[PDB]
């Protein structure tokens, strides 16, 4: 790894990219129903996104907080993990930073071909269906951030560690979705799948 | 290094 800061402008990018995906996240996976759903335009395209204002909140109140962390390089995983009835994990989409040594060299240039790069994201979301197994009905979501080894900004919006049950996911089938190696990070979307749900 | 999770529950709808 290296030690570099991420800064506002990749930051607020990366935030406003995890928002449109965990919107499509939820939509594409049926954790909430097609009707709170109605279409918006991101990255130059019609993506689904939730009308509930308080679902809309929550996902904002959430990304509000892992976003100075982005800033300063200071997060390695953000996932979000969808939990049966039973609150045990069914499916995990996680989102992958990292920084590794020489990256910038050969890389893609995110700030300048961002609906380009992110596109692809929200294309490979859109159609993970097709690698996936219907989740049971009565599923509900969280996000996980795992913070670096090297949070509470928001008024009445506190963290916890999340308990071994939010994460303990027994047999997973793994599914990469798409890789984005740009200038200051790299990041990594892929799909964990419990085996029979 | 967490993980850390929001304390307050996803709305239902």
């Known amino acids: 790894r290296q030690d570099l800061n991420f800064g506002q402008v990749v930051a607020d990018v990366l935030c406003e990219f995890l928002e449109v995906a965990v919107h499509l996240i939820l939509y594409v996976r049926e954790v909430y129903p097609v009707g709170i759903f109605q279409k918006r335009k991101k990255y130059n395209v019609p993506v689904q996104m939730s009308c509930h204002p308080e679902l809309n909140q929550y996902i904002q109140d959430t990304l509000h907080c892992v976003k100075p962390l982005l800033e300063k390089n200071d997060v390695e995983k953000v996932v979000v993990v969808i939990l049966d009835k039973e609150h045990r994990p069914v499916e995990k989409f996680v989102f992958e930073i990292t920084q590794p ?57 506190p963290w916890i560690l999340a308990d071994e049950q939010d994460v303990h996911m027994h047999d997973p089938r793994l599914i990469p979705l798409k890789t984005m190696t740009s200038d200051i990070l790299k990041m990594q979307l892929y799909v964990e799948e419990r085996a029979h749900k | 290094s967490g993980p850390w999770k929001p304390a307050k529950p996803a709305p239902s709808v």
């Open chain 1, 101 to 157: 040594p020489l990256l910038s060299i050969s890389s893609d240039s995110l700030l300048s071909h961002v609906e380009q790069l992110l596109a692809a994201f929200i294309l490979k979301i859109s159609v993970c269906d097709a690698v996936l197994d219907h989740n049971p009905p009565g599923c509900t979501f969280t996000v996980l951030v795992h913070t670096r080894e090297a949070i509470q900004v928001i008024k009445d919006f």
